[PDB]
Amino acid sequence: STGSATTTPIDSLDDAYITPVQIGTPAQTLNLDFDTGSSDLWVFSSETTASEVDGQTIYTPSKSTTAKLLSGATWSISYGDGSSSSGDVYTDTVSVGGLTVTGQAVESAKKVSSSFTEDSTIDGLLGLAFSTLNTVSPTQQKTFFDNAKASLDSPVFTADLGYHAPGTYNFGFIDTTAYTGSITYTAVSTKQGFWEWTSTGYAVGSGTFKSTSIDGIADTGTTLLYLPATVVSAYWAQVSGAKSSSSVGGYVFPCSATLPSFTFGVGSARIVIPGDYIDFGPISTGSSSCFGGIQSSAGIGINIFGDVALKAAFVVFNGATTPTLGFASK
Structure with a gap:
């Protein structure tokens, strides 16, 4: 298999890039920040403190017929810029650019820090570093890429980020x-x-x-x-x-x-x-x-x-x- 999705700058300065991701059944499309420096796939959700949501699209697991609460699993992450988020965990179907993983850990935010709230364009992160960094406890979870790898034509993904323009993330081919x-x-x-x-x-x-x-x-x-x-x-x-x-x-x-x-x-x-x-x-x-x-x-x-x-x-x-x-x- 392969996948291919367009990634788009969030603003005129290329401060970050967002890529559409389909989560659940029926699909809920959220725009995520693909992050090769972290290993959690987390989303704004119906469980996020209301005052901490300001324009983001949310994942509502109760509306996904394939979502399952991962019992006892929580997550909490801090990033190098001082931002943070935390919450609970569902498994659900996740698709990127036509590539589908079933049983992906989707980390649903109960709390996000102010920088996340203040950025209405980013609905969550999709981590692409190594799964050893994943923060889910007590059972660490695998990244989207690690879950997809065996099914990919080649065990690779590519980043082609644009300057003031869209670009592409590809999975499974060059x-x-x-x-x-x-x-x-x-x-x-x-x-x-x-x-x-x-x-x-x-x-x-x-x-x-x-x-x-x-x-x-x-x-x-x-x-x-x-x-x-x-x-x-x-x-x-x-x-x-x-x-x-x-x-x-x-x-x-x-x-x-x-x-x-x-x-x-x-x-x-x-x-x-x-x-x-x-x-x-x-x-x-x-x-x-x-x-x-x-x-x-x-x-x-x-x-x-x-x-x-x-x-x-x-x-x-x-x-x-x-x-x-x-x-x-x-």
């Missing part, structure tokens, strides 16, 4: 028309439950490539690119007027700037992030200071190849017995 050149594959460590890999270096603009190992995670659920302070300082030094602002919480730059590109290495191959992908717009409405899309990972404890990086590539998440990651230009 669309050879979706990229240019070849796909370069690189080793993955699953020891922390992430798609963790080592970039071979970087360049700023037309500058010389610096060969240096940068361990990090491929995380579609993180918007920005978080890299070591030395790398980030070298990037913003090429932008007149850019500075690190403690009050704003990162590097900011004049909105009038034209930003340089940023290149990262994948083995001997190179992925070029155009400068415009690094502009996240005014820091507050009407400001002429803009928020940078490349930020320091100091104090995060891990480097994160988020959407800013991933959207410049066609990315293969190879879930074979020994997982690997592939990157192609596009």
Whole structure:
């Protein structure tokens, strides 16, 4: 089997991407944030505290003839941005782009934090990291991909995120028309439950490539690119007027700037992030200071190849017995 679904930016800045997902019988379609940095499939629901729902579409398990409460199972997750959610668990039928899993754990939110409430466009998350990170207790549950893997034509999924435009998540096949050149594959460590890999270096603009190992995670659920302070300082030094602002919480730059590109290495191959992908717009409405899309990972404890990086590539998440990651230009 295979599946293919379009993923769409939630806003004009590509702050996140949503993908329609069918849950239950008859189908209830919710728009979920596919997150290769976490391993829970959770949804706003009829059980979510009413004051914490503000425009999201909800899953109502009582209206699904295939939903079954998973007795005694609860979940609770916190994300790197400080947001969180928790609740109970149903098993139900879940379909993405024509690919169907029966018996998928659907984690129904009883509580969500304010950032989730304040984002009316995201109805939940669909985790695509390794199932060892799943938070359901006392019996850990499998991700959608892990449940589907054996049925897929090939045990892979691909992320093709657009810049200011829709893109695609494919399951079970590699669309050879979706990229240019070849796909370069690189080793993955699953020891922390992430798609963790080592970039071979970087360049700023037309500058010389610096060969240096940068361990990090491929995380579609993180918007920005978080890299070591030395790398980030070298990037913003090429932008007149850019500075690190403690009050704003990162590097900011004049909105009038034209930003340089940023290149990262994948083995001997190179992925070029155009400068415009690094502009996240005014820091507050009407400001002429803009928020940078490349930020320091100091104090995060891990480097994160988020959407800013991933959207410049066609990315293969190879879930074979020994997982690997592939990157192609596009």
